[PDB]
Design a protein around this ligand. Structure first.
Ligand SMILES: O=C(COc1ccc(F)cc1)N1CCCC1
Ligand SMILES: O=C(COc1ccc(F)cc1)N1CCCC1
Ligand SMILES: O=C(COc1ccc(F)cc1)N1CCCC1
Ligand SMILES: [Cl-]
Ligand SMILES: [Cl-]
Ligand SMILES: [Cl-]
Lengths: 697, 695
């Protein structure tokens, strides 16, 4: 609903944005033929957003966005992940291998061009209209003969929007020498850690600092000791005016995916298959894992990351199912499609109703297969560690059946066994997880639909899942180190072919691939019908109050700094303070440890010009902007386009917002720029970064 | 802020009127006439109640009338789960061992008691706080035939302000109090233990009783000839509801507070009482919950024991949060330093000497008190086999006449009560191994109960082996082991039984510590009499209330929410919409009564919903309440009933030592929700009709 707008849509939205508080001129925010604020936004490392905040190429993004780079430069002598990092001179800034920043140099509507090229249709069912290979061939044809050679650092890309009803060509400028400049300690950068993931109120200082480097002329160049900081076209001014409740706020960034044009049948499928299976299976997996972690401190160390990784999409699915149950998402999709069908009936065009019917029929037809796919994926592929145990390759089996190539096969199988049964793998914990996961899987999936090896639970083990799992480990070459070494000393292909763990792993992966291959053909009729469906919605209600689905391209969103009521008699305000960090401090809980320098700043009220009018130190705020994954690190702007914060999360109540925006619950969780500048200043003591920024009173 | 004596109403009236009170002083409390105070009762010795009709109808909490609802519940008519609604007065159920106490008269007898005390001689006598001594004075003042000359009436004298003020209460007690109505437990206890001490709250915590009496309205025990009481005063029910900042007041019987604790007593309360209870109960509850989650039969057997352990555990967590964050220790220290500076200026050193005596006594009893709480939390309440059978002297002097069978039948009865339908020896062994490992780490060998010395001496430090051996060799270790003993009982078998020796040994140490600690209470009590006398002489009997002591008090404040933490606000009122948000059909605590769910769906709120069409459930107020105030009437600026107090938020449990204006709230069930449940859930129109409901 309140959307993720194309840069092209700024003109038609500008008057509403101005009426909601926007004060800057339209072309100062986005101008297709000149420098604008859009030129200070970057796609940071392929999946995050960033922003240029100085005339020397300084870039701000989230701490969780720059996390891998902070970790790659961290050692026992200089643990930057734990203590932070503050380069005191430009020469001290650390280079990063495999990093990139993408500027969106130009954006152009190429719809008529693509649609004319598509008219050369050798099959009306062709999926070339959505093919990256096909669209790249059109982008190259339009850009010219050797565009990348004649314009180094530039590249061209065409993307489909609105289900193939609109196409845009992006001219991108990519820089690959992006150095680490500064980062707060993890105690600030990820204060809530996993406990506060998707949570508002939030007290996390989620930021990190980088710098784009380039050749002498400001052109992209790979890492070189001769590289000089980039003088950019445009950079954000930092505001110290802060935020007030109801203030206008806007974001530019790269939201990844949404499903705003789902039919009511796709919402039901998302709930009853995708979300219910993921919720049920992960709750079983996590329940066994947590009991083992709480009983053995060594198991807690080995399984903490696996547990946290499983919980992230589990929490998302819980938040999504809450919106489906309470916010009428299914009903609003049904009303949307009924309105189009009634309009099509009045216009004498039945193709829109036929398109919704095709989507419904495809959803209803793939139901059993999709249920079986999610059941095996959540239950076994993700749920059971020994599902990803070593499977001897075709060439490994061939090698073991008269040359020195036998020792090569054993060394390769050993390397994979050592990665599977690593320092964090417990066979006992895995057997307990598998017994609970398989009991549920065997209750849901009938004998005729089971992976071939799982048929042995009924046929050979008289229904005893525990005995079947015990037997896999007791007899398998991968059941223990001593069992592998005995095999490695005298390896036979016939031992591997009958190995209970190899057979289980092969069998479950075979069933997983068979289901994937059977389900793949159902995607195309839905995609083709969505092109007709979205064309109708656009022709009926216009390319105005319905935004194109997110597709990792540059979008803008606007709203207000506003809290919300999560439940009866509870209100969460629009702004958190440093006081809230101190309330959450728990010295013996690694997630809620408070940095001693920050604790002292709070005690002494050493807030400088960064505190609010009441002398309180702001930390984070929330806004009615419409964001999703991909928007991490996005610049948050004032009514004047000045930087007031960085987007870093969204509350769980708004995760259903990828299908239907939730005005009374959905909020972008943003780190206040005053808190960012406080941490750089009083925690990092990196005055040179403050000095190179243009800070407005 | 306080829990004021009825006598202090005159002194507080102007401030109450400035805060919004509209009723005349003597209409609320009149020392020589009828007033609203006459409609308040002490319900069943530990709760408050209120008369709401000219036919003796009484409202109190559901958790206050819980035992009576349960005593009348059968498999055929389960009133606890289904609710109860007597459709005629003759259908109201009598209750054995129930009482309602009216506070007929209250008088200051300070000079009388202080003159009588002057005859003591021993300056360290504790008669000034002795219920037996004070009752002898109460009887002497009332007369040598008071209860016979004034039927239903009794007198009682209590100490206040540490023995600096005394009041005599004339009480009228009724023992025929019948069950009239109760909502189902899904309404009466909606939050169940999850929402205990929690605001926001969505629980309709009420039950309905009726006082019966003889033909003249005089107290009489249960009789089929008893007629409902026509009281001299009852509350009018308001349907005007509440708004944020509205004046609210409560009358009730708060039990205990510790408003005059020294800073050393706050430290002791934190570092001994609360930390030990928190640490020990967390170990006990952790083992119990693991076992309950792994075996559904263990969950059935241990649910009540788990819930009972959690209640004071949650209280201690809330209390320690206030000590850590609200500066309770610091404010007591400032209070005592101010008195000491004032006593230095006046030339009277006795106040500083009194605070010093309290500090020295606290410091001296520290190790013993730590040992007492450690054994009490760790073993006496932590381990079930600590309360296993110990053969009496009469029982041993029977097994060494044919009364050997009677001794075995008595020991068997106690064994059967210990190892009952809810007792698991396996769960108990696991709880004991974890509890004893912690206890053995905290209590040194020389301070251990004698049998626990065997962990180091006989079992090479293996707690698991020591516990396994207790059950493997004890006659109370299993039914088969008891039966083998019962067939061939010898006193030598009992005298060497590892479970009997453990149980005896831990109870001996528990009694020895109790007896060693008891003498330390008296110097603190005597010094508190001097300490509070100084505080009263210095800052007056005006902004410092006497500690609660289960006597009638009033408190006033406003209907107001609060901010529990940064960027979070809890408003002053919950709604029926909040009950529906919490509904979880497969969680017994959050099941919603189908009749109530239908009322919400159809918006069948009648005259009970607010101006916006939303149905209120509960509200909170800045009144100062504690345990004993459950069921208390909550009044308007006009003295009309707007709700019943039923709980207080955990953030305010430290309020028994220092009132917390920004966090402490009384959790009250809205009277409009009470009437909506009587009407649309119970269908008991006769109860609505007998109440005086004001628009
Ligand atoms: O308003 C529109 C198109 O709107 C957009 C065109 C390009 C773009 F990048 C974004 C929007 N139309 C109304 C009549 C049919 C076309
Ligand atoms: O309170 C919850 C879930 O709470 C969280 C969900 C996800 C998350 F990341 C954090 C909390 N619910 C009550 C209604 C059904 C869901
Ligand atoms: O949130 C809590 C405790 O919460 C409850 C305590 C008791 C209770 F009955 C219910 C909740 N705390 C945060 C700061 C340390 C204590
Ligand atoms: Cl058509
Ligand atoms: Cl909404
Ligand atoms: Cl009366």
């Amino acid at each position: 609903d309140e959307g993720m707008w194309l840069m092209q849509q700024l003109g038609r939205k500008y008057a509403q944005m101005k009426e909601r508080g926007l004060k800057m001129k339209e072309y100062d925010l986005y101008n297709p033929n000149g420098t604008s604020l859009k030129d200070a936004v970057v796609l940071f490392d392929g999946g995050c957003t960033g922003e240029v905040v100085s005339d020397r190429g300084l870039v701000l993004t989230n701490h969780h966005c720059g996390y891998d780079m902070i970790q790659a430069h961290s050692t026992l002598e200089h643990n930057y992940l734990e203590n932070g990092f503050w380069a005191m001179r430009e020469a001290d800034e650390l280079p990063n291998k495999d990093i990139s920043v993408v500027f969106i140099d130009k954006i152009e509507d190429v719809t008529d061009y693509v649609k004319k090229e598509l008219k050369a249709i050798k099959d009306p069912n062709s999926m070339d209209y959505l093919s990256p290979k096909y669209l790249q061939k059109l982008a190259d044809k339009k850009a010219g003969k050797n565009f990348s050679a004649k314009n180094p650092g530039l590249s061209v890309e065409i993307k489909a929007f609105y289900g193939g009803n609109l196409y845009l060509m992006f001219t991108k400028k990519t820089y690959t020498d992006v150095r680490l400049v500064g980062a707060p300690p993890s105690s600030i950068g990820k204060f809530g850690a996993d406990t506060d993931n998707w949570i508002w109120p939030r007290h996390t200082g989620d930021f990190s600092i980088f710098r784009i480097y380039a050749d002498k002329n400001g052109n992209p160049a790979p890492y070189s000791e001769d590289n000089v900081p980039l003088k950019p076209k445009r950079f954000f001014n930092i505001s110290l005016g802060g935020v007030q409740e109801n203030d206008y706020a806007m974001i530019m960034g790269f939201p990844g995916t949404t499903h705003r044009y789902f039919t009511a049948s796709e919402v039901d499928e998302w709930k009853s298959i995708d979300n219910d299976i993921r919720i049920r299976m992960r709750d079983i997996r996590q329940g066994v894992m947590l009991r083992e972690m709480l009983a053995d401190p060594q198991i807690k160390i080995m399984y903490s990351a696996k547990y946290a990784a499983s919980q992230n999409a589990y929490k998302r699915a819980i938040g999504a199912n809450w919106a489906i149950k309470t916010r009428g998402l299914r009903q609003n999709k049904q009303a949307m499609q009924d309105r189009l069908i009634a309009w099509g009936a009045k216009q004498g065009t039945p193709r829109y109703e036929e398109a919704v019917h095709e989507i419904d029929a495809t959803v209803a037809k793939r139901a059993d297969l999709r249920r079986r796919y999610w059941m095996i994926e959540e239950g076994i592929i993700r749920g059971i560690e020994f599902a990803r145990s070593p499977i001897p390759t075709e060439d490994e089996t061939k090698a073991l059946q008269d040359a020195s190539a036998r020792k090569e096969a054993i060394d390769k199988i050993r390397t994979r066994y050592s990665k599977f049964a690593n320092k964090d793998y417990s066979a006992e914990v895995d057997k307990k997880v598998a017994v609970a996961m398989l009991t549920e899987y065997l209750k849901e999936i009938p004998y005729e639909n089971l992976p071939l090896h799982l048929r042995l639970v009924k046929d050979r083990f008289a229904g005893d899942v525990q005995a079947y799992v015990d037997d896999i480990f007791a007899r398998s070459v991968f059941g223990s180190e001593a069992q592998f070494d005995a095999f490695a000393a005298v390896p036979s292909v016939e031992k591997l072919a009958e190995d209970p763990m190899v057979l289980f792993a092969s069998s479950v992966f075979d069933e997983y691939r068979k289901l994937y291959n059977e389900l793949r053909p159902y995607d195309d009729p839905i995609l083709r019908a969505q092109r007709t469906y979205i064309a109708g919605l656009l022709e009926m209600d216009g390319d105005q109050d319905q935004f194109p689905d997110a597709n990792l391209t540059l979008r803008f969103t606007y709203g207000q700094v506003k809290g919300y009521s999560p439940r009866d008699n509870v209100y969460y305000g629009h702004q958190t303070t440093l006081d809230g960090v101190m309330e959450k401090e728990d010295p013996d809980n690694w997630e809620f440890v408070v940095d001693p320098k920050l604790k002292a700043v709070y005690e002494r009220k050493d807030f400088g010009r960064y505190a609010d009018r009441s002398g309180r130190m702001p930390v984070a705020f929330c806004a009615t902007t419409h964001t999703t994954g991909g928007n991490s690190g996005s610049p948050v702007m004032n009514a004047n386009g000045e930087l007031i914060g960085l987007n870093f999360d969204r509350n769980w109540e708004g995760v259903g917002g990828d299908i239907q925006y939730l005005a009374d619950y959905q909020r972008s969780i943003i780190v206040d720029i005053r808190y960012v500048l406080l941490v750089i200043d009083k925690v990092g003591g990196c005055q040179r970064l403050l000095d190179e920024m243009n800070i407005v009173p």
